[PDB]
Design a protein around this motif. Structure first.
Motif, PDB file in Angstrom:
ATOM      1  N   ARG A   1      -8.293  -1.443   0.841  1.00 15.97           N
ATOM      2  CA  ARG A   1      -7.457  -0.248   0.734  1.00 15.97           C
ATOM      3  C   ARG A   1      -6.897  -0.138  -0.673  1.00 15.97           C
ATOM      4  NH1 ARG A   1      -4.524   2.987   1.892  1.00 15.97           N
ATOM      5  NH2 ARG A   1      -2.881   2.572   3.439  1.00 15.97           N
TER       6      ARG A   1
ATOM      7  N   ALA B   1      -9.919   0.569  -3.408  1.00 21.76           N
ATOM      8  CA  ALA B   1     -10.314   1.979  -3.421  1.00 21.76           C
ATOM      9  C   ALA B   1      -9.280   2.849  -4.140  1.00 21.76           C
ATOM     10  CB  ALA B   1     -10.575   2.491  -1.998  1.00 21.76           C
ATOM     11  N   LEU B   2      -8.003   2.550  -3.927  1.00 18.27           N
ATOM     12  CA  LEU B   2      -6.909   3.283  -4.579  1.00 18.27           C
ATOM     13  C   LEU B   2      -6.887   3.094  -6.086  1.00 18.27           C
ATOM     14  CD1 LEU B   2      -4.091   3.098  -1.873  1.00 18.27           C
ATOM     15  CD2 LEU B   2      -4.888   5.145  -3.093  1.00 18.27           C
TER      16      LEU B   2
ATOM     17  N   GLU C   1       0.475   5.934   6.090  1.00 15.72           N
ATOM     18  CA  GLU C   1       1.260   4.897   5.431  1.00 15.72           C
ATOM     19  C   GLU C   1       2.531   4.566   6.196  1.00 15.72           C
ATOM     20  OE1 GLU C   1       1.830   5.988   1.314  1.00 15.72           O
ATOM     21  OE2 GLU C   1      -0.321   5.926   0.907  1.00 15.72           O
TER      22      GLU C   1
ATOM     23  N   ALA D   1     -15.080   0.268   2.570  1.00 21.12           N
ATOM     24  CA  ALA D   1     -14.107   1.158   1.953  1.00 21.12           C
ATOM     25  C   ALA D   1     -14.671   1.865   0.699  1.00 21.12           C
ATOM     26  CB  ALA D   1     -12.803   0.402   1.633  1.00 21.12           C
ATOM     27  N   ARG D   2     -15.980   1.731   0.452  1.00 19.76           N
ATOM     28  CA  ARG D   2     -16.675   2.437  -0.629  1.00 19.76           C
ATOM     29  C   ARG D   2     -16.167   2.029  -2.008  1.00 19.76           C
ATOM     30  NH1 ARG D   2     -16.931   8.587   1.968  1.00 19.76           N
ATOM     31  NH2 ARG D   2     -18.508   8.105   3.568  1.00 19.76           N
TER      32      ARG D   2
ATOM     33  N   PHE E   1     -18.603  -1.994  -6.624  1.00 21.61           N
ATOM     34  CA  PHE E   1     -18.684  -3.405  -7.023  1.00 21.61           C
ATOM     35  C   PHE E   1     -18.778  -3.566  -8.535  1.00 21.61           C
ATOM     36  CE2 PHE E   1     -20.863  -4.710  -2.736  1.00 21.61           C
ATOM     37  CZ  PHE E   1     -19.648  -4.652  -2.069  1.00 21.61           C
ATOM     38  N   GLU E   2     -19.461  -2.630  -9.195  1.00 20.74           N
ATOM     39  CA  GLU E   2     -19.625  -2.686 -10.648  1.00 20.74           C
ATOM     40  C   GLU E   2     -18.313  -2.476 -11.391  1.00 20.74           C
ATOM     41  OE1 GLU E   2     -21.451  -1.094  -8.509  1.00 20.74           O
ATOM     42  OE2 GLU E   2     -23.580  -1.549  -8.821  1.00 20.74           O
TER      43      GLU E   2
ATOM     44  N   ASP F   1       4.908  -1.112   4.888  1.00 23.39           N
ATOM     45  CA  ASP F   1       5.682  -1.944   3.961  1.00 23.39           C
ATOM     46  C   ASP F   1       7.159  -2.003   4.345  1.00 23.39           C
ATOM     47  OD1 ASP F   1       3.261  -2.265   2.607  1.00 23.39           O
ATOM     48  OD2 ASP F   1       3.814  -0.964   0.911  1.00 23.39           O
TER      49      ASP F   1
ATOM     50  N   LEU G   1       1.261   3.656  -3.132  1.00 24.21           N
ATOM     51  CA  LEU G   1       0.497   3.020  -4.194  1.00 24.21           C
ATOM     52  C   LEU G   1      -0.250   4.025  -5.065  1.00 24.21           C
ATOM     53  CD1 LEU G   1      -0.467   0.530  -5.699  1.00 24.21           C
ATOM     54  CD2 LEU G   1      -2.245   0.198  -3.949  1.00 24.21           C
ATOM     55  N   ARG G   2      -0.659   5.166  -4.513  1.00 22.70           N
ATOM     56  CA  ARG G   2      -1.374   6.178  -5.309  1.00 22.70           C
ATOM     57  C   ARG G   2      -0.511   6.623  -6.477  1.00 22.70           C
ATOM     58  NH1 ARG G   2      -3.474   9.050  -1.593  1.00 22.70           N
ATOM     59  NH2 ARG G   2      -5.664   8.729  -2.183  1.00 22.70           N
TER      60      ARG G   2
ATOM     61  N   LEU H   1       0.796  -1.226   0.000  1.00 25.91           N
ATOM     62  CA  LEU H   1       0.000   0.000   0.000  1.00 25.91           C
ATOM     63  C   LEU H   1       0.829   1.276   0.000  1.00 25.91           C
ATOM     64  CD1 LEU H   1      -2.672  -1.297   2.543  1.00 25.91           C
ATOM     65  CD2 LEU H   1      -2.959  -0.910   0.043  1.00 25.91           C
TER      66      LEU H   1
ATOM     67  N   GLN I   1     -10.125   2.330   9.331  1.00 25.78           N
ATOM     68  CA  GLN I   1      -8.908   2.090   8.540  1.00 25.78           C
ATOM     69  C   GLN I   1      -7.642   2.565   9.254  1.00 25.78           C
ATOM     70  OE1 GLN I   1      -9.026   2.673   4.282  1.00 25.78           O
ATOM     71  NE2 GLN I   1     -11.242   2.867   4.272  1.00 25.78           N
TER      72      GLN I   1
ATOM     73  N   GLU J   1      -9.827   4.980  -7.742  1.00 28.17           N
ATOM     74  CA  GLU J   1      -9.598   6.420  -7.741  1.00 28.17           C
ATOM     75  C   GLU J   1      -8.618   6.804  -8.861  1.00 28.17           C
ATOM     76  OE1 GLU J   1      -6.746   7.974  -4.891  1.00 28.17           O
ATOM     77  OE2 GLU J   1      -8.267   9.280  -4.036  1.00 28.17           O
TER      78      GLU J   1
ATOM     79  N   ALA K   1      -8.457   7.464  -0.093  1.00 23.67           N
ATOM     80  CA  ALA K   1      -9.242   7.290  -1.296  1.00 23.67           C
ATOM     81  C   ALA K   1     -10.699   7.053  -0.918  1.00 23.67           C
ATOM     82  CB  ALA K   1      -8.698   6.127  -2.119  1.00 23.67           C
ATOM     83  N   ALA K   2     -11.595   7.793  -1.584  1.00 24.33           N
ATOM     84  CA  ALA K   2     -13.059   7.733  -1.392  1.00 24.33           C
ATOM     85  C   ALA K   2     -13.591   8.369  -0.098  1.00 24.33           C
ATOM     86  CB  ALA K   2     -13.577   6.293  -1.549  1.00 24.33           C
ATOM     87  N   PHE K   3     -12.709   9.013   0.662  1.00 23.31           N
ATOM     88  CA  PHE K   3     -13.074   9.750   1.869  1.00 23.31           C
ATOM     89  C   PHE K   3     -12.484  11.169   1.829  1.00 23.31           C
ATOM     90  CE2 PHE K   3     -13.829   5.409   2.987  1.00 23.31           C
ATOM     91  CZ  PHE K   3     -14.881   5.430   3.912  1.00 23.31           C
TER      92      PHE K   3
END
Ligand code: 2FP
Lengths: 340, 341, 341, 341
Positions: free
Chosen positions: B165, B168-169, D116, B215-216, B219-220, D119, B122-123, B119, D157, B172, D107-109
């Motif tokens: 996590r 969601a990333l 972070e 985590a929003r 699903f689609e 890792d 990762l963005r 993670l 989270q 986005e 992300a999404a919030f």
């Protein structure tokens, strides 16, 4: 084999474009309906009104897979002397039984409720099974406004009680109808359809999480939810929008293992309830059947035409049969404005 | 909004028209193990040749494979003809994707279980990968199993949480995330029954989707890549039909209909098992999602053996990859038979 | 202010080295206890036995902060014409009411239970308050064995019912006693103290989580847990180890905001229950009061001496008075074995 | 023995009226602080600045139990050629290390963050242990407004990341400081003390729930929370009220098993931070030690006085010593306004 029996009961209730007559109003609720047409709420009037519905031959044979009953009615006889459950069965419909004892205030959560009825329920279910009921129903009332209601607490507590109710039912051989109603017509009813979508989503998610943890067989239950719709005092969502959003929320939150979803009418007009259901059934193939479990949307016209009078039986039955048939067509995706 | 709509479109393409995914995303350590079995030295150039051979199997790539999962290295590699390896993938009508986890590491306080890392940063890595042509991503959670103690609730929820996590990333960034929670059939313990795999997989998928939900995640706009419900590698008694049935059963209970597609990992099944199972699942009538493949070994083992590290064998190794691709293509359509070979 | 009142009642119930007489046995349970000493379980005998306890003024005035009652007893008159609760109040003790309707089998969880009683509980509490009850009680029964029982599901569902009960009690003006008992004397009684430790940890954690979600005021409740102890038929743990491990699990799971912890005796001998509590109160400063809420450990000897006989009233009172005093001393950390003689 | 060592380290960090110097500001953060007083943020000015603090004999020997360091500083030598960690050890203070890589957008919030740094953490921790670090720190940043922020999602989270870090620290033998900060001084900061009380309560509840599930030893960690306080631009809560509400929320949510709580100053003035801590320690017996882990509240005045010049080392060390001593007295509940003179 208990599983197989439950699966078969659930499928029959949602099969062949048929649906559920919700005639399970408690004494105070039916009293409210009767009072709106100036009819006295006596036990004989309740019997007579219900008898009128259950002997409406066309609707009961061609449209109604099951009838949800209140306790009094389950034990009542027709004027002819025959048990009312036996009239229901002679039409090829399955008798079912509402088992909750009502939505009561939830301690520490103002303006929200918790449904009661778990105590002694194992024993009530065994008795009801003996009397011929093959499904049960429990209603959770979820309050809603723009931001503060409902709370996660109220949702979780109601979903937990639903799960307890559902496991007991299945243990007794009855298919539970699980009814989590996000209110369109509660004390606060100016919310948008978007707000109802987000709340219904969280509600259904939590409901199914709790049913899972409580080891409820998804294949042997029926969901009776509200549609995704704006509040009664702020209705702008079109039929299409209502259908599209409703089916979208269900795809996200109701497992494919559930055999059917039978919607509540929830304050909607007679015609709305039908149009909405019909448009959902033309949106392509769905992993569960979509049908009706309507109280008001099947009854309100019959009740008004009946007006408490024996001489109005036929004309009351006509109104009921007509709405039963429109909703049958809606369950098949075949209803149009022209057929009214 | 429009972006959600786009994530669906990408997700649908990846599982549509009886096509499936080539899982070519083996890390350096993993692909090295696969090379060492057939006696080929694991060097950058041999990894480049091997993968170029797969991506230039035109008929297999054009007709069977909707997308390819790549490892970081491969995404940045040129083919011997001077184009990017990803150009070849796109010229064949396939979409490139990128595995983004950094491996399954031991989980503190949970002996014999792992937690997947990757993670951090990762963005920024996702944004870079999108500019390199990646349109979907992948993260593997490794779920240990035995008769009664493994996997723990804690190990499952922590893995499910990292998967969410990640998802969601990805969304986005504009990448469809492949969510891969694998209950191992070929782990340190592998004599468990199919009923045990059913129950374990049920709790894993349930928890994964609970966490995706919180985590929003849309699903689609995602793909699931689960194991099939199968007995352990060293106690295989369950039939093709039973694997197909019990797998479809568990998914109808735990995988929302809003998910467009499920692309199975082969997990250590034989080439033919993985194919037969997929085909028998698509013979069970109508389902709420697409059922197809995201196979590594079950698409590759044979080609790799035929390749044997040698340029002379590109033709033959391509033949053996084209065959498996075509069989699994038929399996995706529910049209495979043992007769089709 | 009504929050402040709950705090006051709760503090009174665990204050001044006093503790709770648990006299709330339901008809079947008190029937089992009377049958052991060959006494018929009639309403009159139950009245007679409870009246013997409540008229033992020495113990009631010095040792007993409160009395848990069963519905029947709360409505019963003494032989002298007062309400039984008048006798309790005159001695300076607070009357309390058990409100659960028993531990019934839990659907889908063989060999585990769920406690009933929430239906109409608002109206019962209101009525019970007018009858003089200022605190209530509810018992969750948690089964245990070496590896399979209890399930997380049974604990969760039982914690959730407890929390529903507690929120209702506080709304009605009564302090709830929250009783989650991991059974030492159920069908499996050969489990280790380590096993009890791990199970009690999860039970108490889950209990306080649900109380928290249901907005229960921690400062206005009492916890009545089992001590951490091995099974009845495999008793190895010394007095010190039980005391130490129990305090340890409580420091990990029971918020400092809770004012008192009133243990159940749970099948332990009369002396064990006294000694364990005294040892726990000799460990230095703790964030909550530790006292007793004993049934068997305060009543067993008195019952045997009573033997359903009016002529045995004085001798039964003396037995009870002795055990009340010893437990009083334990609540102060002042008990020694010498003082039993 | 691992447990026993974590416990001993933890106890030392909060013992004897001492507290933690939070000197772990990252490059960007220290650069903001330096820019405020007109000093260029070079590596040499950061070294020189921290050296000035760590050689303040009286402050370091008598008030500071431990120093949180940023990576760069942990590897830095003093002007004398000696490792800065050895300077710290020679004053009787324990070196510790912040291990997070920063609070990033979640992300999404919108408007919330996720921290972070998980890792490769096991490997970093093993290296830090060898280098003399015996505790670690990780900061979760919780946004807050009147109604909408923070979300349950963001809290969960962050708590889950916190628990992952804490488990890893303990495995490597470092005591994790768990720092979940509800901001008083973020974008929105007119929220009331009641609102902070409710938000902090859910945050602390969620943090300890996730630590529990991740098998974190409570006895071998330290909490570093915000005090319960109103937003920076709506300060009305008295000293007494902050103290009282802070201790109240901690008794509700932080297990007695936790040996110590070391507050962040969080944007409070130097004097407020001291007075609040002192008032909290004058409220009678508490289940844990309450002390300081101050950054700004211990340094702002020293930094201002230092002004980037060697010429001012003495006047800077004096201003730091006075605050170290004021906070030592606060840790003992012995501070008064008169002692600022
Ligand atoms: C899929 C499943 O492939 P098969 O199980 O079908 O081979 C693949 O994406 C694997 O998860 C992947 O090779 C694991 O790679 P690693 O994380 O070890 O570098």
């Amino acid at each position: 084999s208990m599983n197989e029996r439950l699966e078969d009961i659930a499928l029959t209730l949602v099969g062949a474009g048929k649906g559920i007559l919700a005639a399970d109003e408690s004494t105070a609720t039916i009293g409210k309906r009767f009072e709106s047409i100036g009819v006295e709420c006596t036990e004989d009037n309740r019997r007579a009104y219900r008898e009128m519905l259950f002997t409406a031959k066309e609707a009961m044979e061609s449209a109604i897979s099951g009838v949800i009953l209140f306790d009094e009615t389950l034990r009542q006889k027709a004027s002819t002397g025959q048990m009312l459950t036996d009239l229901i069965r002679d039409a090829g419909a399955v008798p079912g039984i509402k088992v909750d004892t009502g939505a009561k205030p939830l301690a520490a959560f103002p303006q929200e409720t918790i449904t009661e009825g778990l105590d002694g329920l194992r024993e009530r279910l065994k008795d009801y099974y003996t009397l011929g009921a093959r499904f049960a129903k429990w209603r959770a009332v979820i309050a809603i406004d723009a931001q503060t209601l409902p709370t996660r607490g109220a949702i979780s507590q109601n979903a937990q009680a639903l799960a307890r109710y559902a496991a007991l039912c299945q243990e007794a051989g009855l298919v539970p109808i699980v009814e989590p109603e996000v209110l369109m017509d509660g004390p606060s009813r100016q919310h948008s359809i978007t707000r109802c979508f987000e709340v219904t989503k969280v509600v259904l998610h939590t409901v199914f999480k709790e049913l899972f943890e409580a080891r409820v067989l998804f294949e042997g239950m029926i969901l009776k939810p509200n549609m995704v719709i704006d509040g009664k005092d702020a209705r702008i969502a079109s039929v299409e929008e209502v259908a599209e959003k409703t089916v979208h929320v269900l795809k996200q939150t109701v497992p494919a293992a559930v055999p059917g979803i039978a919607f509540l009418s929830g304050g909607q007009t007679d015609e709305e309830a039908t149009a909405h259901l019909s448009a959902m059934n033309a949106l392509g193939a769905l992993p569960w059947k979509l049908t009706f479990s309507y109280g008001r949307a099947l009854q309100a016209a019959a009740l008004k035409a009946w007006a408490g009078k024996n001489e109005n039986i036929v004309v009351a039955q006509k109104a009921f049969c007509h709405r039963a048939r429109m909703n049958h067509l809606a369950a098949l995706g075949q209803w149009t404005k022209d057929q009214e």
